[PDB]
UniProtKB/Swiss-Prot annotation, chains A, C:
Organism, scientific name: Homo sapiens
Membrane topology annotation: Multi-pass membrane protein
Secretion signal span: none
Recorded consequence of changing residue 29 to A: Loss of gap junction ion conductance, probably due to very low open probability of the channels. Can form functional channels with wild-type, but with strongly reduced channel conductance
SMART domains, A to Z: CNX, Connexin_CCC
Domain of life of the source: Eukaryota
Gene name linked to the record: GJB2
Protein family per UniProt: Belongs to the connexin family. Beta-type (group I) subfamily.
Disease link: Deafness, autosomal recessive, 1A: A form of non-syndromic sensorineural hearing loss. Sensorineural deafness results from damage to the neural receptors of the inner ear, the nerve pathways to the brain, or the area of the brain that receives sound information. Deafness, autosomal dominant, 3A: A form of non-syndromic sensorineural hearing loss. Sensorineural deafness results from damage to the neural receptors of the inner ear, the nerve pathways to the brain, or the area of the brain that receives sound information.
Protein name, as recorded: Gap junction beta-2 protein
Segments in the Cytoplasmic topological domain: 9-15, 182-192
Effect of residue 139 to R: In a patient with congenital erythrokeratodermia; uncertain significance
Role this protein plays: Structural component of gap junctions. Gap junctions are dodecameric channels that connect the cytoplasm of adjoining cells. They are formed by the docking of two hexameric hemichannels, one from each cell membrane. Small molecules and ions diffuse from one cell to a neighboring cell via the central pore.
Length: 192, 190, 192, 190, 181, 191
């Protein structure tokens, strides 16, 4: 683990070291050591005021098609890949940190992909969960529930706090990446 | 784990680097980090509208003869085996260019991976009549009286991860197929 | 773990190594060895005297918007971040423990940030939980609970003991950090 | 992990290295990462159609005197012991100096065949075959007359049982092959 | 000797191996599925406590810890004497220590083996336990979880423990044969 | 882990290595491999003969204000702290027999270990009125009506492990005290 952090650390620019702390210290550690157990009882303590068998199963599924923690884990995997794909290609090309030559296209594309992956996952969070605040009460009318059934979410306030934290840090990583693009564009295209 | 990956990563060709990345970061990490706890309550939260004792047991067993995550773990072990068999056999002969007797092993090893990957993709489709999980399963196996209604836990999340794994597996098939294109053009056309 | 502790402790001053012992041995170890499993049944054995569905969910959420251990985990991440940020920037300059030059500004700011983070989290603990004692009984009247219902907290006394222990150690870490600022401000501002 | 596997790998014959992969990657991995959790709810989800207290306890105990995964773990420990003994004895033999190897190596292979066959035999006799039934009928005290009990995940347990039995049979053939190679050179080679 | 290191350490690793990867999960549900035919609150708590004052696996864990110490105490005494002599520079004494540690291991192995027999009046676990401790009214029938699997692992641990007694005794008599001769 | 164990093992006196083996193999290993699973169901299997909601919660809290394993975990951290702090203070001077300035720190570290062990042993006695756990506790705290009967989980096993930890701690106190005599007899002879 130290080698992986050190290996990525030694092959990054000035801001590329700041970006690595924001990813490991906050996105990963908070997801692992603080937020994973907040969502542990997400369906166990989902409570619906009904006597209909199977009503709770389909109402929880309707309102949480994918868990927040599963969405964040997918985002972290998608974002860490370009940062390490450029390293694996570097080892291959070297076998056969300033930016020059062919590495310029790979590094710039990797920065571009992370911005796209960041914004896409942030947009999925907003659209799917119609905001970043979790409600105490959800009203569900999917079959087999009769009419509209009241259901109550487990730990809505604590999940809102961690949702705001994850979204805000993701926005910071967006700003740090578009800034790095500006520096590369100034040095290369505006440098001419 | 880091040492094991380093051995496989070093002894690979140009495409084999991309294939190794797709295998570890996607097949393994999603299965371990994100998919494993989705299937945690597959039978605990399986709910059947009945009063018949034992009806839930036979009904869950009918519609899920093997879990999705258990089927994916078997696929990973079978796919990862030819890669490590090549390394073990190569180290034995010592006691990346492809030439000599190692050519027959490498070409065969990739061929097995396509067979294993497509076979497990076929079993997924046949056993689960598609890649989309349903909310409701109807059930008439003994001792369930007539047809009973049963409800699946987290069907939408399970579909999302199923679609992801099938799509990534399809990518791995194409990468292995293109290897046989760059190996037969070197041999048959040369 | 040994390398990370070995890396941080080497690049530290006299008191700054005492501060590392109070952080690792007491804040981290108490949190993960003892305190974490004290809070494991926090909502499972939250008991409310009522027959209203969903009333337990909203009353627990009202009185524990975020768990104590989750608050402490976030505090430890924030407090330890400036120390590691200094280490990462130090390697940046060397590839490009007396305090001199421009390293003075980074070290002094890192100490200042840690005091602010420590006091902020200590302030949030007091405001959110109206003191450092956990009560046996909470009275809750949030919807959909009818009138006011009686709810009972799990292990309030053990949680009070660990809450006092964490606050006291955090206050000690504040005192050590303030002392270090006094030493540095003697050299520079009092020197003039 | 890497060191223990690496140590046993370096001191082995041509076939014996094929035996190492078929033991670790398949016996241990399927047992650890796929099969152990399948048996996790074996008694929790065991359901008996009765109102008699204590009837579920004795019926499960009657039909599962020892769990499949516990039986496989014991077999893996016993099968891997002769290889462990050889390495420990070989290190001691080197220290004493600071033919004989042939006798220990042949005997270790012999014990592995006996241990594999004995455990495979116990699986057959104890569970009257390799297929798990959905319904067991139990009349042990204190169950009144005969009660119906339902097994948890019988189909998934059958799939893994068939898998471990088949891999074990392959191991027996590999050890027999190595046993014949040594016999032909020494006894028939006179 | 050959039995002194190879056989004794392998049997020790075997006992640890059984305890962790096999035995621990067998006892994980000992009180959860302890079932008593009664309606008396607290009756199940005191009946389980009466018949299982300490769990089998917890007793085995104490055995393996106590059996390990005489060897470890020998190493500390041996290493300290060598280093202290080496630093000062900058057999006969060991023999009375080595034979003592072997003697202690026999004593510990037999003492724990005897405790197993007396505490559980045998090595076979029963399906049914009859309990009459307060507050249970009259005698209450209670049912043990997985008694057959627990008997199989008990036999495995006892038999391996008894072999270690014979191996330790064999080495002890071997030294005392030479010492007298 | 071997670095931590090796570090303390290397820098210790003749008796200081005996105290080290009785702390790891017995205090730590038994707390980790045997004791923590004994206390796992301490409140889940705590049973009270009542129909009053919340009565079980306050009765368990009254009679077990802090768990035995949590009290032991705190004691181990406090007892092991001075032994480590010697190394950190020693390594500080090294990169910048007992004699010199080390004599005052080592003697003080021994002194704190005895005080911490005695304080925690005293807390165990005062808080839990002896070292034997009872099967039945009578509780009358609000909201329990009158006095209710509550039954502890695994009281005999907990008593067995409680006796073992107290006995080993008393052995540790004697070992620390005997090292307080070897150091003091040398200076007393000098006086
Ligand atoms: C970065 C952290 C951002 C924290 C604020 C985001 C969450 C907004 C809701 C909020 O603050 O809730 C309040 C409690 O605050 C809290 O509990 C805030 C705790 C933050 C501590 C620092 C981390 C009480 O508002 P409410 O009870 O009406 O909330 C119902 C909505 N879920
Ligand atoms: C790889 C991409 C996987 C997503 C596409 C396939 C999944 C199809 C299911 C789907 O669209 O579900 C919707 C939610 O989408 C989702 O939950 C998609 C989230 C994707 C996040 C990024 C990966 C709403 O589902 P519905 O309301 O129609 O459900 C009723 C039937 N289950
Ligand atoms: C340092 C930590 C100890 C100082 C704070 C102790 C606060 C809790 C306290 O006083 O609890 C009393 C018993 O003390 C204790 O249980 C003190 C235990 C100290 C153990 C050593 C660490 C019970 O007092 P109460 O019955 O009024 O509790 C009302 C709460 N629900
Ligand atoms: C290794 C491959 C093992 C394949 C054979 C195992 C299954 C044999 C029993 C069988 O015919 O299963 C029937 C359908 O099979 C199935 O549908 C089994 C699915 C096989 C998946 C293989 C993936 C590799 C269920 O019929 P049943 O009710 O008798 O099942 C048992 C519960 N009683
Ligand atoms: C070394 C292994 C020795 C196992 C001894 C088993 C004695 C218990 C016994 O009578 O087992 C009967 C069948 O055993 C079995 O069917 C299990 C035999 C051991 C399996 C293979 C171990 C390797 C069950 O019959 P019972 O009702 O008398 O059981 C008595 C338990 N309470
Ligand atoms: C270190 C050894 C500690 C042994 C002393 C602890 C047990 C003393 C209490 C006692 O008399 O226990 C009775 C039977 O003891 C027993 O049978 C205790 C067995 C301890 C075996 C230790 C082997 C190592 C059970 O009766 P009780 O009701 O007094 O039990 C106490 C809970 N109420």
């Amino acid at each position: 683990l130290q080698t992986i952090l050190g290996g990525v650390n030694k092959h990054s620019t000035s801001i590329g070291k700041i970006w690595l702390t924001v990813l490991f210290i906050f996105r990963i550690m908070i997801l692992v050591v603080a937020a994973k157990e907040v969502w542990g009882d997400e369906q166990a303590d989902f409570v619906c005021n009904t006597l209909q068998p199977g009503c709770k199963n389909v109402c929880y599924d309707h309102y949480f098609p994918i868990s927040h923690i599963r969405l964040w884990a997918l985002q972290l995997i998608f974002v860490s890949t370009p940062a390490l794909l450029v390293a694996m290609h570097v080892a291959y090309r070297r076998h056969e940190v300033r930016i020059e030559g062919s590495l310029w296209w790979t590094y710039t594309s990797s920065i571009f992909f992370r911005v796209i992956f960041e914004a896409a996952f942030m947009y999925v969070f907003y659209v799917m969960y119609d905001g970043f605040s979790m409600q105490r009460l959800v009203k569900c009318n999917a079959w087999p529930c009769p009419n509209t059934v009241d259901c109550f979410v487990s730990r809505p306030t604590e999940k809102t706090v961690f949702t705001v934290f994850m979204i805000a840090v993701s926005g910071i990583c967006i700003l740090l990446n578009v800034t790095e693009l500006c520096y590369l564009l100034i040095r290369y295209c505006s440098g001419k």
